[model samples]
Structure formats: C-alpha cells, structure tokens
Target chain A: MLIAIEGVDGAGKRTLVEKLSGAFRAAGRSVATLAFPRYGQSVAADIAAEALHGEHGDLASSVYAMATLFALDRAGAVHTIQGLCRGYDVVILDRYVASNAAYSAARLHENAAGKAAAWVQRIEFARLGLPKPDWQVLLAVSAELAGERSRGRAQRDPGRARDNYERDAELQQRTGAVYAELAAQGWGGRWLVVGADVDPGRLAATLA
Target chain B: MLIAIEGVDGAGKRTLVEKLSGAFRAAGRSVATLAFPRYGQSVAADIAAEALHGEHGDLASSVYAMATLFALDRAGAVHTIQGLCRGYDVVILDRYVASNAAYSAARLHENAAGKAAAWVQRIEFARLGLPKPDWQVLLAVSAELAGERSRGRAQRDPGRARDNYERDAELQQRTGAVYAELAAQGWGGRWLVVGADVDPGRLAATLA
Candidate 1:
C-alpha cells in the first residue's frame, strides 16, 4: 500500500510522516518512505529549489513550468518508488501527485475541481506514469498557523528559510482550501484528513 | 508572424533560422529569433540537458517527464516570445511546440496524430499559455543523413557529444516521421516542409 501525505509548507507533513512511519515500525509493519522535491538529490528538484529561493531568475513565476519541475522530480524516482512498494508492506510519501495538483491549481487561481487541477492530474499521473497513492493524508492547518510554523522554522534553522511558495500567504490559503477539496474528492483513492495539532500516529490503525 | 523551424537533430535547423533571419533583415523586415531548450538560460532547459547527458539519473527515461522539461523551457519564455511577436515583423524559432509534440510522441512510440501528441499540444499551448506559431517549417532529412551529421558535429566539437535523444536512431526516425505528420496536421499553424539540403532562404518570400 502507498500512502501520500500532503499539505502546504509548515503543515508538519514531514513530522507527521516521521511519526506515522515510527508507529508503523513499532507495530511491526515493514515501511519505506519517500519525500518529494528530494532537495539536493534530484536535478529538477534542485533547480526548482534554486528557483524557489530566487536563484534561477523568473522560473518561480510560471506555475505550469514550476509544477513540471516538481513532477519531473517524482517521475525520475518512479522506479525506486515502485521498488520500495514491492519490498515494503507500506510505502509512505511525504508528498505526491496531490501536491502538484493542489499547488498548481492554487497558483492558477483554480478551485480543486478546476481545469488546472485536472490538467495537473492528467500530466503527472496519466502521462508521467507515476503510481497514484492508495490513500492521501491531508494535514489540515490554518494558513496563519502554517505561516507561523514556517517562519519559526526559518528562525530555528537559518538554512530553512522560506521559499517562494511558503512566502505567499494567499497562495498558502488557497492551496490549503484546494487540498481540502481534493481530500474530499478522494483524489486517487481514500483520504484521511487530520487536524494539524492531532497526533497522526492515532491514525496508524486506520492506515494499517 | 511567428514561424517555427523544426526537424530531427542535425536537420540544419539553426542554419536555416540564421539564414532566414538574415534574409528578413536584409529585406528591411524586423526579425527576432529564438530557440527551444534555450540551454543555459532556462533552468528547465538546463536540467533537461543534464538529464539528456545522463548526469541526472534516469530522468531521460520518462518521456512525459523529459517532455515537460522541454515544455517548461518554452513556457518560461512565453512572455518574451509574445513580446517579440508584438515588436518584430517576424519571429523565428529554431524549434517550438512541434518539437515537444514530435519528440515526445516518438518517444512514446505514438504517431503525430496520436494521443501523446494531442496531450503535449494541450499541455504546452492550451494550458501553459504559449502562443501558437503562425507557421512551422519541417526540414526533412533521412535518419541516416541526420545521424551522420550529428556524429560529424560531435567529432568536430567534442563538448557537443550526442545525448540520449540523438544517440537513438529509432527515436530519430520516429521523430522525423512525427514532424512530417505534424506538418500535415498544421499543428498550431500552417506547416512548410522543406528538404534539409535545400536553402531554406528560397522559402523566404513564401514566409514573408
């Protein structure tokens, strides 16, 4: 089974993934994890990060273009993801297709069911051949709270400075709403919406 | 008017673009020229190049992923292309939407009129908001000749060794056929088919 955890920046997606993976392991389930925009490992992801940090000129301006970079990062890892899925009882993704759909839809001023969202879904899932998640977990958090968490992370670690996506409060708000709608839509499969403050570990039984 | 020149690798596209631009300028027509995969200038292009060269690790293996990189390069330049179109009497592109359509379609083993081609068109032109070319020029060259020219160029310029795309003879053959079909389909605009060995300058009058 593959489960994708998605949320806007600072929605504690990474933390939730960690907690959930730990819980799965404690429960004696074989688990493997994957994170998107694999930071320094993926060329597309690295370029996207650079653009997000304002290094690659105007790349951050085109939502479709930026989304392609993110999608390519996952496309590059599809084989590895597939391998992990075959070996592990559960494969957890920090973020996956939903991230591309939600973020690009928000950037294009589109609601969850808008053409932009559909386009992203078709492009990343249908065309790119990346496996759809069996279930998606949305870590629901308010835009204000997400913003605070992002800023706090930057303060706590200078290297964790907010990128173009994290810096835009309006984009975050719109993306959060879109993500919620996508969760309700069940994206590819089931959706588990959990509040930000709630322990994602409690959902371990539901996931397993 | 916007004219896109497209063909397989080493089909003399750059030379044609230069010759056409010079002819237009000599005729006192204001001309601007651009190229796809604008290499160093576009982050997406740069990453795509790295992937093609086998430095980015399996990225080139996914046709949709690679196509998106090329598409994003064009998407990033849409505004500039539009601006040039508004200011110049003629805007010439060494390659444009047709290249993405042809190459990706070929990679997926889809004919020009196939679903992959249509998807590329929808993604790059309709969704990414790139302006449609007024006309496209396909320089037809036999795959053997194109391969020979590519190899010759690589020998002359060691730094320009053949990348993943150019190294595949079947891909080149398929892409050439797809380009021809796209021409017949009038993708984005009317298409002008010309021989690679012929002086594209002869078509200057027809274009103007």
Candidate 2:
C-alpha cells in the first residue's frame, strides 16, 4: 500500500505521521518514512527547510525557487521510494510530491490549484523518472483548532513559529477547505480524511 | 517561429542570432531575442556561469546546481514569453529550453548524460511552464577552428576554456554526432545544420 499524508502547518501532520508509522510497525509491517526537503543529505531539502523556517526567505520572496528546491529533493528520492515499494508490502511518505505542489502553489497564491498540482506531479515524474502514488490520507481539522495547536509552541526564538499562515485563522480556513476539496475529489488516488479530534491510533486504523 | 542557435563557445552563436533577428524583423515579423542563463539578472544563471567558469567548483557540481537554477530562472519568465507570443507573430528565444538540456546533459562527464538530460528538462519544464521550442539551429564546426577563435579573446578564463574531454578530437566528434542524432529526431520544432565556415549573408539566407 502506498500512502501520502497532507495538511497545513500545525495540523499535527508530523505527530500523526510518527504515530501512524509506529502503529504500522507494531503490526508487523515495515515502514520507511520519507520527509520532504530531506534534512541534510538532500541539497534540495536543505534549501526547502531554510525557505520554510525563514532562514532563506518567505515563499513570495522566491516561492518558485523554494518550491523547485523541495520538488527536486523529492525527485532525488524517488528511486529509493520505488525500491521500497517493490520490496515491502507497505510504504508511507511523511510528505511527498503532493504536499510540495499543493502547499507551494497555495503559498505562492497560484490561481489554479488543480493545475499547479498536476504540473508539480508531471514535473516531479520527469525529475525523478518515477510514477504516482496509490493512496492519499489527508489529516483534517478546523482552522481554529489548527491555529491553536500551531501557536501552542513556546516562543523559543524570534521566529520559532516560522509557519506563520497558521496565525491567520481565515486564510488557514481557506487552505483547509482546499485540502478537504482535494481529499473529496480523491486527488488521483484513493483518499481518506481523518479528523483531528479522533485518536491517532484509531484514525490510522481506519485509514489502514 | 521560435528559433535557437547552438554550438561551441566560439562557433558564433551570438553573431548569428543578431543577423537572424534582423532578418526576421526585416520580414515584418516581431522578434524577441531570449538567451539562456541571461547571466546578468538571473541568480541561477550566475550560479551556472560561475560553475561553468569554475568559480563554484567542478563541472558536476556546477552543472547540477546551475541546471536547476537556470530552469527556475526560465520559470520566472513564463509570463513575459507567453505574453510576447500573443503580441508577436513569432517569438525567438536564442537559447530556449532544449539547449540547456542538450548541452548540460551532453557534457555531464561525472553522471549519465541521458539521465542528466531528462532531469534538466523536467526541472526546466516545471520552471518555465511553457511550450517547447519551435525551431532549433545547430552550427557545426571543427574544434581546431573553434579553438582558434577562442584564442583571440582578451581574457580567456580557465573555467571558460574547454575541458579535457572537450579537447579530445574524438569526443568532440562524438558530441557533434549526438547533436546530429537530436536534429534528425527533429528537436525543437524543426532542426537545421549550418556550417560555421558559411558567410553571414549566406547562412542567414539558408536559415531563412
């Protein structure tokens, strides 16, 4: 099974991915987690994280630049993921090509979300020389709840909360709406929407 | 018609483009000369040129980085190009997308040239988000003559000079052969081979 998880910042995407991975492994399934903008090894990922965390610049400053960095980073990892799929029964991508397209397009305020998503997938297909996913799991939550969870982090540094769109409830709500719309349409794969209120384990089980 | 002039550094791509642009304009056609790496205003272009010139390191290091940067720069200009196409009967890009893919992929000695070409094309397509070339012009020349032309420059930077492999007559001959293969396959919208020894007036007429 190929699965992809996606949602806005502070939507508990990372936490849920950890739990999901744990559950899968505990059940005798092997899980290899792939994250976007790979931490250190991937040049594309490094720049992407920098772009996200504000060390480099905001999306608008050079959204296309940062987006390509992340896209290429994911492309760089396609072969590994494809290999895992051939070897293992289950494969989970923490954040994959889809998220890169959706988030970047939204951050850049692209008019055609669907077109942007399609373009990202096409470009990535060409970059990695790989195919598409089989399933997509979207973590769903209200914008207000996502915002509260986003801001809950203690102020560690001037920009500890680099994911700032979470602060604007209205805009994030729109983003969430878009995500739901995407999930509803299936987004080129089998789709599921797991509410934030549900226990992580139960939600993972439902999706699994 | 979208046109491209490609060959070695001293094969007179720039001069030919100037004359060709004049010919197109004289025929009551609006023409735009868009070159690759437009190194002056492009951040990615700067990286590519620096890499090519050895300021950023080896061929592999520079090509990998510059290939992606150049694509992003192209993506940043999609609107202007598209808008120009709408206003003009024909749009000419001196160094359109194919040149980078072909040149970089052909010269990526450290990596598989075929893979490099695909990767570069994917990123460039994503970056530019536009149509491919409508025409491509290959200026064929002997390396000895090309080298003689390069020697006349007041400052020939080490990074800008030919690489060891590029200096090999056999390899240069093979690369030229590969260009022929691409042209035969109808790269760009169409392909034409022009001898570097041909006079400017004759070459322009032949090209026209």
Candidate 3:
C-alpha cells in the first residue's frame, strides 16, 4: 500500500518516515521511502528549489506556478512509485499531492476545499495521472512546535538552510490549519493524523 | 494594445516579433518586447530549457508538466506585460498563451478546443490572472522551411543549440496545424495569419 506523509515544514517528516519504516520492517513488512521535491534529482524540483530560494523573480508568489513545479515532480514519479508498490509491502512518501494543495491554499488564504486546493487536485490527480494513496499520514504538530523544530534542525545541520517558505511562521500556521482540514475532509482518499511523539509501532499495527 | 506572436519552434517567431515591432514603430507607434520561457530570467524557463534538452528524465515527455513551466514563466510576467501595455502603444510578446495551447494540443494530437488546450487556457487566463491580448500575429511557415531555417541558424551560430523540440520536423508540423486551428477558432482574442515572408509595412499598417 502507498502512504504519503503530510505535514508542515520542519514537522520531522523524514524522521517520522524513518521511524515508521523501521517499525514496519520490524513487523516483517517490506518497506521503502521516497522524499520530494526530489531536490537535485528532478528538473522540476530543482526549479522549485530555485523558486523558493528567491530566484525566479516573483515566481515564488505565483501559487499555482510553484505548485506545478511540485506537482510535476510527483507526476514524473508515477511509474517509479508504482514499481515500489509492487516490490514493497509498505511504500512511504515524505510528501505528496496534499503538500501542493496545502501550500496553495495557505498562500491564497483558503482551506482544503478552497478553489486553490481543487485546482491543485485537478492538475495533479485529474490531469497529470498521479496514483492515489491508500492512506496518508498527517504529522500533526503545532505550528509553534513546527517552527521550533524547524529552527533547531537548521542549527543542528548548518547545510539545512531554511527557505522563505520554511521561515514563514505565520504561513506555516495557516498551512497547518488547511492540512488539518484536509484530514478532516478526507480530501485525498483515507487519512490519519498523529502527533510528533506518536508511537510508530502502534501506528504500524493499526495500519496493517 | 498587446499582441503575442505565435508559431511552431523555428517558425521565425523571434524574427516575426522584431518585424512587427519595427513595422509598428515606423507607423509612429511606441512598442516594447518580451519573450516567453524567459530563459535565464525565469526558473521555470531554465527548468523548461533543461527539460527540453533531456535533463529531466521523462519530464520533457509530460506535456502538462512542460506546459506548466512555460505557463508559469508567463504567469510571472503578467505584471511586467501589464506595465509594458501602459508604457507603449503596443506590447509584443514573442510567445504567449496560445503558444502553450498550441504545443499542448499538438503533443496530445488535439485541436484548439481539445482538453489539453482548454486546461492550458484555464491555468493561464482564468487562474493565473494574465491579461488578455488585443491581437496576436501568427507567422505561418511550412514545417519543411522551418526545419531548414532552424538548421541554417545553428550552422551560422554554433552556440545556438537546436533543442529536441526544434529538431522534431513532425511535431513542428503538428504544432503548425494546431496553431492554425487556434487562430481560426479565435482561441485567444483576434488573430491575423501572415506568411513567414509577408510584407512588414502592410501588416504594420493594418495593426495600427
């Protein structure tokens, strides 16, 4: 089954993914993990990186444009993701379609069901032919705590420079609400929300 | 008034834009120019350039993904185009919304009213809030002649690399037909079709 992990920036999605993968592996379930905006691995991702880092001249402010970059990264991975599903019992995505919707909604000051979110859905799911997840995990952390952890990570690892999106405390909180509404609405198939301190073993048990 | 120039790649869009600009200028009209896929000036454009050159794996094959990059480049230029409209009697774009529609439709083997074309229009006109053009000029050229000029230019300027799109004679022909449909359908406001070797003075007189 494919499960995408959703959360605000600095919500420890990578660590959470690792913990969940370990737990699933310990339970004798084959597991794999993929993180995105695939960084240097994708042209769209690299463009997204450039856009988020004050390049692209106001492209950062073009919500749908930025979302398209992220969406294209996933679209290109559709087949790869399908392959992982066949080889692994549990394939985890660090961030998926909802990231685009959440960020788009937040940027436009809307919720999960807003026009922006629907537009992202149309592009990613309806038009781009991305696979649907069986379940998605929302790494529910307080926006305040998300910021604290985000700042801590940059300090712990000097190379983890926070981009403009990561550094926006206010926008993070707005996105947090939209993310919550996504789970509340079951916007993309089934969803589960858990705290940062949740038990990975217990969650894995429930998932299986 | 704002006028966008449309044609297949290597169809002399740049030269047509220049010819139009000069034509209108000689008619005592103020004019300005902007090109789509802003190249180094836009992250989306740079990514598109990379994608077209085969740096993005299958992303170049993803029609919507590639179009979104082109669309985003234009989305970011909305304000700049608006400013140009106010500053000059005519603002000429080397490529514009129809360029995305024509390419998308051509790639999908559809005409002007195809799903892909409509989706492109929705993203660019309705969602991105880009300004509508008063008129657009299509530099109609045979796909064979386009290929000839394209190769001729590359030989004359070694640094002017012919991207995969420019080298595709068949896709260029397909795109030419789609571009014709766009103009015939009045896809984006009024359109005037002229031969690649049309008289600049006569065209300029009609536009003014």
Candidate 4:
C-alpha cells in the first residue's frame, strides 16, 4: 500500500513516518519511505522553500506558481516512486499530493473542493501523472499546537528553520482546516485521521 | 509592446536586445529588457539549469517536467513583464513562450503544432496567465554555428559553460528546426527571422 501522511507544518509527520516505518519493520513488512517538498533532493522543492521564505520575489506572492513548484517536485520523482512501489510491501510518504491541495486551498482561502485544490489535483494526478496514494493519513492537530511544535522545531534544530507558512499562525489555522475538509471528502484516497494521542504502532497495525 | 526575441543558444539574442534597447531609446521610446531561463533570478530557471547540467537525476530526463520548469520561469516573471509593459514603451524578452514550445516540441520529436508545444502554450499563457508577446523575433542560425558559439562562450567564460542541451548537437539541430516551424506558423505572435549576418541596427530599425 502506498500511504501518504500529511499535515500542516508541525503536525508530527516525520515522527509518525519514523514510528510507522519502525512498526512495519517490526511486523516483518518490507518498507520504503519518501518525502514530498524534498527540500534538498528536489530542485522544485528547494525553489518552493525559497519562495515561501520570500527569497524569490513575487514567486511566493503567487500561490499558483508556488503550488506548481511543489507539484513539479513530485512529478520529477514519479519513477522513483514507481520503483519503490514495485519493491516495497508498504511505501510511506511523509507528504504527498493532498498536502499540496490543502496548502494551495489554504493560501487561496479556498476549501478542499475549491479551485486551488482542484487545480493541484489536476496538475499532480492528471497532468503530471503522479500516482494517487492508496491511503492518506492526516495528522489532525490544532493551529496553536501545530504552531508551537513548528517553532519548537526551529529552536531544537537551527538547520530546520520554520518557513513563512509555519510562522503565519493564521495560514496554519486555515491550512489545518483545509486538511480536515479534504479528509472529510477523502480528497486523495482512503482517509485516516490521527491525533496527538494516537499510538503509531497501533495505527500501523490498523493500516497493515 | 511586448517583443520576444528567441532562438537557439548562440542566436545573437543579447546583441539584438542591446541594439533594440539602444534604438528604441534613441528614438525616444523607453525600453526595458528581461531574459528567460533567468538563471540567477527565477527559482524555476535556476532549477531548470541545474537539471540541464544533470545535477538532479531524472529531472533532466523528463521532457514535460523540463518544459514546465521553463514555463514556470516565465510564469514567475509575469508581473515583472506587466510592470515593464506599464513603465516602458517597449518590453523585450530574451526568450518567451515560444522558446518553451519549440524546445518541448524538439525534445519530444514533435513539430511545432504537436502536443508538447501545445501543452507549453496552455500552461504558460492560458493556465499561468502569462501575457502573450505582440511580436516574436527569431534569431536564425544553423545548429552547427550555434553549437560552435555556445562552446566558444564556454571557452571564453567558464561560468557560461554549455549545458546538456547546448552540448547536444542533435537536440540543438532539432530545436532550431522546431523554432523555424513555429516561426513559419507564427506560433506565438507576429514573426521576424534574422540571420547572423544581419546588422543589429538595421534589424532594430525594422522592428521600430
């Protein structure tokens, strides 16, 4: 199964991914992992990060262009993803298409079914031909908590600076709302919503 | 007027741009210039360059993704172009939508009217809402000469090293052919083709 774990800036996506990867390995299921907006690995992702941080003038200003950069990052990784699917019993993505949709919709002040979200879907799944996730796991959390954890990450690791998106508490609020809406609609594929109290091992067992 | 000057790598676009900017200024018309594949400026352009140099594996291999990056470079410049249009009597681009279309078609081994070119047109102009140029000037040159000058630039300035596309004689040949076909069809806008022997001042005056 191709599992895509998504959330706002500090919804504990990495933690969940590590826990799940460990859990799956403990269960004897071969696993592989990939992350979206692959900061250094993908040029598009790096550019997207630069834009979000206001490095590229007007690029961050344009939601359309920013969303496209994220989509391109995934498009460039399609073959690698396909190969992973072929080799692994379960492939977990730290982030994926739904994240793009939620973020675009949030930036545009649109809901999951709105134009921005739809455009992201079309660009990634239809035009770029990124494989749709077999399951989407949304890390449900409040804007306040997400923001706290996001800032905490920056303090814990200076290398992982919180980006503009993480800094904007309201955008996180809106983004989390959009993610919830997308989950309600099962935007990408089958949906699983996890909260802060959820055990990753239990979740992995359920998924498996 | 939005004027897009395009051609293969060594097609004298910069010289023509300087002449046109000079001519327009002498004629008391304000002129501003912007170049595409805006290497250091646009993130998309920078990423495209990195991919072309084979920095990011598989990114350079996908024609669609490469074309999208070029288109996004232009997309990221839309507001700048619009600003230039508002402030200057003439805004000249070193490259524009046609370059994306031609190169995409060439890479896909398709003609100007083929799917790749059409996709570029849709993505850049229609979807991204890039302003279409009022006129397009093709800096005509043989692929062999283009490659020679392209390499000549590398020897002259190591920083201007020829990329994979520039180094590929056959791709350059096909790209030049696609540019010709696009010009013949007036793919983007009004067309003007000028060869290497043409005087820049004369050509500028003709454009004027």
Candidate 5:
C-alpha cells in the first residue's frame, strides 16, 4: 500500500515519515520512503531548487509553473515508486501530489473547491500517470508553530537556507489551510489529520 | 494577430521567425517575437534544458514530465505574451504550444490524432490559460536535412550544445510527421505547412 504524508514545510513531515517507517518496520512490514522533489537526484527538482533560490528570475513567482516543477519531479519517479510498491509492503511518500495542489491553490488564493485546486489534481494524478496514494495523512500544525520550527531548522543548520516557498509565512499559512481542506475532502484516498504532537507509532497503527 | 512557427529544433524556426518579423516591420506593422523554452529566463525552461543536457538524471526519459516543463514555460509567459499582443500589430513566436504537442506525441509514439496530442493542447492552452495562436505554420523539412543542420550548427558554435531532443534523429522524424498532421488538423486556428526552403518574406506576405 502507498501512503502519502503531506503538509507545508516545518509540519514535521520528514520526522513523521521517519517515525512511520520505523513503526512499519517494527511491525514486520517491509517499508520504503520516497521524499520529493528528490533534491539533487532529479532535473526537475534541481530546477525547482534554482527557482526557489531566486536563481531563475520570475519563475519562482509563477504558481502553476513552480507547481509544474514539483509535479514533473514526481512524474519522473513514477516507475521507481511503482517498483517500490511491488517490492515493499508499504511505500511512504514524504510529500506527494497534495503538496503541489495545496501550494498552487494557496498561491492562487483558491481553496480546495477552486478551479486551480481541481486542475492540479487532474494534472498530476490523471494526466501525468502517477499512482494515487491509497491513504493520505496531513501533518496539521499552526502557521506560527510551523514557521518557528522552520526557522529553527535553518538556525541549527546554516547550510539549510530557506527557499522562496518556505520563507513565505503567509503562503505557508494558506497552504496549510488548503492541505487541511484536502484532508477533509479525502483527496486521493482516506485522509487523517494528525497534530504535530501526535505519536507517530499510534498514527501508523490507525493508518494501517 | 499572433502567429506561431513550430517544428523540430533544426527546422529553421528561428530564421523563419526573424524573417517574418522583418517582413511585418517592412509592411508597417509593429511586431514582437517570443521564443520558448525561454532558456535561462524561465525555471521550467531551465529544468527542461538540464534534462536535455543529461545533467539532471532520468528527467529526459519521461515524456510527460519533459512536456510539462515545456508547457509550464509557456504558461509562465502567458501574461507577457498577452501583453505583447495588445501592444503589437503582429506577434510572432519561434515556437509555441504545438511544439509541445508534436514533440510529446512523437516521444510517446502517439500520432497527431492520439489522445496525447489532444491532451497537450488542452493542458497548455485551456487549463493554463494561454492564448491560442491566430495562425500556426509548421516548417516542413526532411529529417536527414534537419539532423544535418542540427549537427552542423553545433559544430560551428561550440556554445550551442545539442539537446537530448535534438540528438534523437528518430524522435525528430516522428515529431516532424506529427507537426505535419497538426497543420492538416489546424489545431487552435489556421495552420499552414511551409517548406523549410520557403522564403520567410513570401510566407509573411501570405500570412498578412
């Protein structure tokens, strides 16, 4: 089964992914984790990074264009993700289509019911041939708290500079709200909204 | 009026665009020209370039993903393109949406009548809110001649590295056929198949 973990940055998606992976392994389930934009591993991801870093001029300013970058990253990895599913009992994604949907919706000031949100879902899942997640979990956290955590990580690691998307507090808040709506709508599959403080092991049990 | 010139990389699109632009200006029409993948100017274009150069790993291998990169580049430039249309009597594009459709269709082994071809037009023009061309011209060229020109250009200008798409002769041939089919179909608006050897001045006169 493929389960996707989605949220704004600093929602603890990475830690949550790690915690869930450990829990799945402890339960004797073969697990694999895939994080996107796979950073240096993908051309689309690298271009996205450049845009986020403001190296590519006005590209970072375009919502759909930036979302397309993220979408292409996932599209390029579809076969590997599918292959992982064939070999593993559980394949978990740190972030998936919901990230694209939420960020683009927020950037466009649209909610889950808006046209941009609907278009993103159709573009990534239906048009791009990416497998939809069997289950989705939103790491719900307040904008203030998420922002604090985001800054804290950058302080701890000077090399971890915040990207254009991560640095925008307003964008993060809007994206978080969109993510919540998507979870409420059960986009892709069954969705569970878990707090930042939730026990990952328990969450895994509920998800399974 | 917006006119788009489309074909494989070596089909003389740039020269045609320049030639047409000069003719319009000489005819007392204000003209503007736009070229895509805007290369360094667009994040999507930058990523597409990396994929074509084999710098970003496996991105060039995904037809849909690569096509999205190209589509997003145009999407990002939509407003600018629209603004240019309002200011100019004639707007000429070196390449436009049809390039994405033909190249992607060929890559996927789908003919012009296939679902993929239809999807690209819908995605780039309808979903992305790009303006459809008033007219389109496909520069018809033999694959062998196009390939020779591609190689010859690279040899003459070391700065002009051949991209993954340009290097694939079979893909170029297939894409050329797809372009011809689209002209026959006249997607978005009027389409004309012009020989690669046709004088740009004469083509511009016909278009005017």
Candidate 6:
C-alpha cells in the first residue's frame, strides 16, 4: 500500500509526516517516506532549482520543471519503494504529485487542484517511468495562517526567490482555497482540515 | 527540407554539411549548423556525458541519457531549424539521430541504426513541428582507417579511455560492417555514400 501527504507551506506537513512514519513504525508496520527536490548534488536538479528560485523564465515552465524533478527524484526511489512494498506492509509519501500540481496550478491562477490531481492519476507518471503514491492525503490549511507562517522564513537562497507561491499574495490565497476545496470534496477518500497547530499524533489518533 | 548527414566518425559528415549549408546560403537561403552534446554551462550535459565517457554506467543507459541531452538540445534548436526551413531552401543536420542511433546502438551492441532512425522519423525536429529529414547521407569508412586517422590527430582528449569500439579490432570491424549494411539496404531515399576526403567545394560533384 502507498500513502501520500500534501499541503501548502506552513501546513505542518513535515511534522505530520514524522508522526505518521513514527506511528506506523511503532505499530511494527513497514513504512518509508520521500520528499521532493531531493538535493542530491544532481546537476540537472541544481540548475532547475536555481531557475525556480531565481525566476529564470516564465512561471509555467518553472512549475513544469519542478514537476519533472519531483517525478524523476521519486523515480530514483522506485527500486526501494518496490522492494519495501513487496517486502513489507506499507509505504508512505510525504508530499507527492498533488503538491506539485496544486502549487504549480495555484500559481497559474486557476483552480488547479483537480487538474493537477488528474494529471497524477493518469498513471503517465509511470509512463515517464516515475513512481506514484497510491493513496493521497490532502492536509487543509487557511490562507491567512499559511501567510503568517511563511513570512517568518527568510528567502535567503536564490531558489527561494523564484517561488511565485511565496512572492504573490493573491496566488497564495487562491492556492489555500483550492486545497480547502479538495479536502471538502474528500479527494483521495480522506481529505481533512485539521488545525495547523494540532499535534499529528492526536490527529492520527482521532482518525484511528 | 531538413537534410541529415550521418556515418562513422571519419566519414566526412562535417564536410558534407558545410557543402550543403553553403549551397543553401548561396541560394539566398538562411541556414544554421548545430552539433550534438551542446554542452552548455548547464551541468546536465556534463553529468550525462560523463556516464558515456567514464565509469558511470553501462553503454545502453548512457546512450539513453545522451539521447535525452540530444532531445533537450534539439528542443533548443527547433526554432532555428524551423526558421531556416521556412525561409531557406534547406536545413541540414550534420550529425543527428541517425548518427546517434548508429553509434549509440553500435556502442550498446544493439541493432539500432533503424531503431535510432525511427526515433528521428517520429519525433518533431523543427520548431513548427515539421516532418523529419528530406534526405539522409551516410559516408562509409573502414575501422582500420578511422583508428589510423584518430592516432594521426595532432591533439587528442586523453581523458576518455577507449571502450570495446576503440580497443578491440574485431568489434570495430563489425561496426564498420553495420554501417555498410545500412547503406546497402537503401535505408532512405537520397541516402548515399560519398567517399571520405572530398573537398567542400567538390562534394556535390563527388557525390554525383
């Protein structure tokens, strides 16, 4: 089985993933986690990331490039994921295609959550020969709170600068709204809007 | 029309392209010449080329990566090729997919001349997504002669060591044989072998 967790910035996805992995491991179930833009000293990823952070070109192309990186990096994990899913009980993805589709489409000023989700669902991800998460978890968060949290992190890196998601206020507002809409629709079966400050352990407990 | 020139390394593809592009220019036509492995400052090509030249991996996977570089580089050239074909009489590819497939497949010990040719045929080569090559020229050379010429070069990049194609006399001989076989099979209309060492001004005469 595969599980994915996705949300915008300040959605506490990092903490949630740690807790989710810990819970699964504590239960004696086999679990694994993967993140995007793995900085593995890859020359292509480095150039691509720089462009995204630097506004190297138009926004559409940058997001598309990010999608390729996310998929390619995940492809680097295929053998491991295959081995575990075949050898163990479960596999988890911290942030998979939804975030890519959501964040990129969010910048396009379109309600892109579903368009992005469908792109991932097409199994063409595998056609590109990249792996995909089986179950998706949409973590809902509010735009106001997300903005307040994002403002605290300094955009010191060049890659940080190209992120239109952070630089544009209107874009962020729409992105949050899209994520909310996805959860309300029960996308991937269990989309939920837990409070940003809520403990992941407590949330998982409530779900159980 | 897009004309492709391909053959063994010493077969004089460069000379042929110079002649063709000159003819196009003299006809008051616009033309451009670009080579493969457009090793820009982008590290993507460097890492990919390293796999082929050094000890990164097997020849097949390396060929695939190099082909990707070819694709990306071609993506960069589509505009120019389109512009020339639209405004000029001919757009010539000095060494492209045909050469790529022949040499790459030859490196991997696969029957790839036709397969490589097929990729070029199916893929859109022009910016406007025009059809493939109007003509393919294959210049044939003997392996012994190519190696002999390689040794005579005043300067050689010694970093990349010789593989089976360069070290083993018999394998080199077989690859040369494959090129000859492709020519005999009449792979493409207007595909002809003009002798190597023909002067640029006399190419059309030599081919005739």
RMSD of each: 16.5, 17.5, 16.6, 17.0, 17.9, 18.6
- Model 1 residue runs over 4 Å out of place are A1-68, A71-208
Best by lDDT: 1
* Residue A108 in model 6: lDDT: 58
Clashes of 1: 0
Residue-level lDDT tens digits of model 6 in A125-194: 6444445555566667776776666665545544333354576777777777767666676554555566
lDDT accuracy of residue B63 in candidate 2: 43
Q: Model 6 shows how many backbone clashes?
A: 2
Model 2 C-alpha lDDT per residue in residues A1-208, reported as the tens digit of each score: 7778888767888887888888877777777677665787664565455544544212324444555576656656777888888887677777666665666556545533455666666556663464566777788877777777777763544545644444556657666766776677766567778876657566556656
Per-model TM-score, in order, reads 0.56, 0.50, 0.56, 0.56, 0.56, 0.48
Can you write out model 1's per-residue Cα lDDT over A68-177, one digit (the tens) per residue?
A: 78877887788999999999999999988899889888888889888778876776788678888888999998899989999999999988999888999999999999
Error of 1 at B150 (Å): 0.5
**Candidate 4: tens digits of C-alpha lDDT, residues B1-208:** 8899999999888988888788788888899999888987765677678768765334576676677678767766778889999998989999889988888778778998788888777667886789888889999898888888888999989788988888878888999999999989988678999887777667667777
lDDT of 1: 0.85
Alpha-carbon lDDT, every model: 0.85, 0.63, 0.84, 0.83, 0.84, 0.57
C-alpha lDDT of candidate 5 relative to the true structure: 0.84
Query: Model 4, residue B52: what's the lDDT?
Result: 82
Query: Candidates' DockQ values?
Result: 0.04, 0.03, 0.04, 0.04, 0.04, 0.03
> Between which residue pairs do clashes occur in model 4?
none
Docking class of 3: incorrect
lDDT of 3 at B115: 83
Model 3, residue A197: what's the lDDT? 82
The i-RMS of candidate 2 is: 11.2
Error of 5 at A194 (Å): 13
